[PDB]
Design a protein around this ligand. Structure first.
Ligand code: DMA
Ligand code: DMA
Ligand code: DMA
Ligand code: DMA
Ligand SMILES: [Mg+2]
Ligand SMILES: [Mg+2]
Ligand SMILES: [Mg+2]
Ligand SMILES: [Mg+2]
Lengths: 357, 357
C-alpha cells in the first residue's frame, strides 16, 4: 500500500519468523543463540527492503488484492523471505570482498571478531569471525526457503513460484561467482561486467522479485513479461547507480566509507570504461588507476584514483546509460494493463532506485 | 534394493541434475562453468551416499514400494538431494577447519587455489579459493532445495517432507555453529560435545534422512518414531566411531591424513574424556594434550598426543558407548512392523556405520 510503510511490515514478518526459531536454536545451545542474535540484528536493522517491495508490487500489478484467495500473511512472508537471501548474499559477500563496514555498521565477521576479544578465548578471532559468518549466511539461506515453504501459501501458489525462485537463487550466486573471477583476472571488458550486473543485481534485486509476486497472484505471461523487462532495465541502472555511489557517493548514503569500491577493487562498468578511455588519453593515468584499484587504502590515494576516473569522462557515459535504461524500463509498464496506483508506485520505485537518492 | 548398488543410482540422479543446470550456468558465463565443475567433481566423486541410503530405507520401511503413488524418479531425486546439503556442509566445514584433504583428494578451496597458480593472475589465490568455495557451497545448498522441490513429488508428499527437511537443515548448521564455539572456548564438557554429535551428525546423517523418506511414503507416527529413535542412537555412535577413526584410523579409511582431528583440534567426546582422565592421572600428560591439540602438525607430534590420549583409557570408554548405542538403536526396529528385508538392511547399515569399517 505504501513505499515508506512496507519495510516496517517486512520487519514484522521477519521478527515473527526469528522468534519462532528461538526454541529450536535454544535446544541446540546458548552459543547458537549468540550466533543467531548476530544474524537477527543484521536482518532486523536492514536496508530499504527493496526486494520484498518489488515482490509486493508484482503481486499487486497482477491484481492480487482483488483476485487472489491466498492469505495476506502468507504473501507477505513470501515477500519478506527475500531478506534472508539478501542476508546470506551480503554476509558472504563481505567476507569475500573483506569489507569492514556494511550499512554504516561493522560487517558480521568483523562484529563476531570483536566478541572474541571480550571473551579472550582460544584461536584466531579473525578466522573465527569468518567461520561463524559463513554458517550465519548458510542459516539465513536455509531460513529463506523455510519462510517461503511454511508461509501458508497454497500448493498451487508454491508451484507457480518455482520459475522465479529457482531462477533468482542460481542467478545471484552465479553472478557473484562471475564477479570474483573478473576481480581475479583483473578483467576490463564492459560486456563481462554487464553480465554480472544482469545476474548478480538485476535478476535478483528487481526482475525476479516482481516475477515471484506476480506468480503468487497467478499473473498472465504478458503481465510477467512486462514486469521482467522493467526489472531488467531498472535493475541494471540500479547497479550502475550503485557503482557511481560506490565511488562518488557520501558515506551517509552508501553505508560504506568513501570510495570503498576502489579499496575492494571492484570491476564495475565505470572502471572498465575509465581504463578503456585512459588508455587512449593518458597512459600515466591508466597506470595510476591500474596500480591503485584493489590495493590503496588511504583516503588521499582513493581520491586521486577517483579523480583520474572522473577525468576520463566515464562517469558521464554511465549517467547516460542510467537515464536511457530508466526511460526504457518505465516504458514497459505501458505495454500491459496494470492498475493506475501500482504503475505509479512502480514508476516512483524506479526513479528512486536509479536517480533519486 | 541394494546397499552397494544404491550409490550408483544416487550418482545418476545427481549427474542428471547437474547436466540440467549447464545451460543456465553457461548463459551467466564460462568462469561460472569452471566454478560449478569443481562442485560437480566434488559431488559426483562422493562418499558412501549414507544420507540418501537412509532416506531410501525410510521410504521402504514405510512400505512405499507397495503403497506409494509417487513416481520412483521423484523419490530418488528427493533422496539424492541430500548430497547437495552434504556438499555445502563439507565445502564450508573444510574452510572453517582449514583442512587440505577431503576424501583422499584436495579440498575444494585448496583445489581452486591451485587453479589460480596455473593462471598466474591478480590477487591472493588462498583467499580466492576460500571465496569461490563459499559460493560453491551456497550453490550446492540452493540446488539441494531445487532438486527436492522440482523432483516431481506431489504437493501432498512435499508438504509431508517439511518437518524432516526444516528440522535437518537448522540442526546441521546449528550443530556446526556449536562445534566451532566449543573449539574457540577450548571446551571440555562431554555434554556440550554430545549436543554437537546429536545435531551436527545424528539428526543430519541418519535420523532426519529416515524421517524424510518415511514422510514421503506417508509413514505412520509410530513407524517414524522408531526410525527416529534408531537414527538418534546409531547416529551418535556413527559420530563417536568417526572421532576414533579421526585419531586412530588409517588415512585410506578416513580420506584425511592420520590424526587430522588433533591437527584441527576438534573438541570430540574422546578428547573431553581424555582430558578429564589425564587431570586425575598425569598432569604432565593433560598439559601435553592441551598444548598439542589445534597446534601441532608433524606426524611425530600427533602420535605423541594420540598415545597420551589412548593411555587415559578414554578410547575404551567411547567403544563401550558405541556398542551400547548400536544395541539400543537396533532394538528400536523391533518396536513396529517393518518388512523383513528392510529391517535386515537397516541392521547391516547400522553395523557398518558404527562397527564395521
Ligand atoms: C548492488 C547491491 C546488490 C547492493 C545491495 O542491495 P541493497 O542496496 O538493496 O542493500 P540493502 O539490503 O542494504 O538495502
Ligand atoms: C549479491 C550481491 C549483490 C552482493 C553485493 O555485492 P557487491 O559487493 O557488488 O555489493 P556491495 O557493494 O553492496 O557489497
Ligand atoms: C562426521 C561426518 C558428518 C562426516 C561426514 O560424513 P560422511 O562420512 O558420510 O562423508 P562422505 O560424504 O564423505 O561419505
Ligand atoms: C556437517 C558436518 C558433519 C561437517 C563435518 O564436520 P567435521 O569436521 O566434524 O567432519 P569431518 O571431520 O568429516 O570434517
Ligand atoms: Mg561487496
Ligand atoms: Mg561483491
Ligand atoms: Mg571437518
Ligand atoms: Mg568441523
Amino acid at each position: 500500500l505504501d513505499l515508506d510503510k512496507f519495510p516496517e511490515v517486512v520487519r514484522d514478518r521477519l521478527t515473527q519468523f526469528l522468534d519462532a526459531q528461538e526454541l529450536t536454536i535454544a535446544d541446540i545451545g546458548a552459543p547458537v543463540t549468540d550466533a543467531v542474535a548476530h544474524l537477527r540484528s543484521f536482518v532486523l536493522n536492514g536496508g530499504k527492503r527493496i526486494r520484498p517491495l518489488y515482490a509486493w508490487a508484482g503481486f499487486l500489478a497482477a491484481q492480487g488484492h482483488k483476485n487472489s484467495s491466498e492469505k495476506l500473511e502468507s504473501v507477505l512472508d513470501a515477500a519478506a523471505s527475500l531478506e534472508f537471501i539478501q542476508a546470506c548474499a551480503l554476509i558472504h559477500d563481505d567476507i569475500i570482498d573483506s569489507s569492514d563496514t556494511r550499512r554504516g555498521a561493522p560487517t558480521v565477521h568483523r562484529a563476531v571478531e570483536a566478541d572474541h576479544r571480550a571473551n579472550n578465548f582460544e584461536g584466531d578471532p579473525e578466522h573465527f569471525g569468518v567461520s561463524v559468518s559463513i554458517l550465519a549466511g548458510d542459516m539465513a539461506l536455509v531460513w529463506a526457503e523455510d519462510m517461503l515453504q511454511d508461509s501458508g501459501l497454497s500448493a498451487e501458489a508454491l508451484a507457480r513460484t518455482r520459475d522465479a525462485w529457482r531462477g533468482m537463487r542460481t542467478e545471484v550466486i552465479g553472478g557473484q561467482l562471475l564477479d570474483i573471477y573478473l576481480e581475479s583476472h583483473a578483467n576490463e571488458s564492459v560486456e563481462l561486467a554487464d553480465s554480472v550486473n544482469r545476474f548478480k543485481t538485476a535478476a535478483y534485486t528487481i526482475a525476479r522479485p516482481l516475477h515471484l509476486g506476480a506468480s503468487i497472484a497467478g499473473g498472465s505471461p504478458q503481465l510477467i513479461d512486462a514486469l521482467l523487462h522493467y526489472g531488467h532495465d531498472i535493475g541494471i541502472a540500479f547497479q550502475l547507480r550503485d557503482d557511481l555511489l560506490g565511488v562518488f557517493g557520501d558515506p551517509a548514503i552508501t553505508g560504506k566509507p568513501a570510495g570503498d569500491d576502489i579499496r575492494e577493487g571492484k570491476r564495475t562498468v565505470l572502471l572498465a570504461l575509465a581504463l578503456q578511455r585512459a588508455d587512449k588519453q593518458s597512459p600515466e593515468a591508466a597506470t595510476a588507476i591500474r596500480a591503485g584499484v584493489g590495493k590503496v587504502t588511504s583516503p588521499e590515494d582513493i581520491a586521486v584514483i577517483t579523480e583520474h576516473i572522473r577525468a576520463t569522462g566515464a562517469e558521464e557515459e554511465v549517467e547516460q546509460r542510467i537515464s536511457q535504461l530508466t526511460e526504457s524500463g518505465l516504458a514497459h509498464l505501458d505495454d500491459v494493463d496494470i492498475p493506475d496506483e501500482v504503475r505509479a508506485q512502480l514508476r516512483a520505485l524506479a526513479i528512486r532506485s536509479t536517480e533519486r537518492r
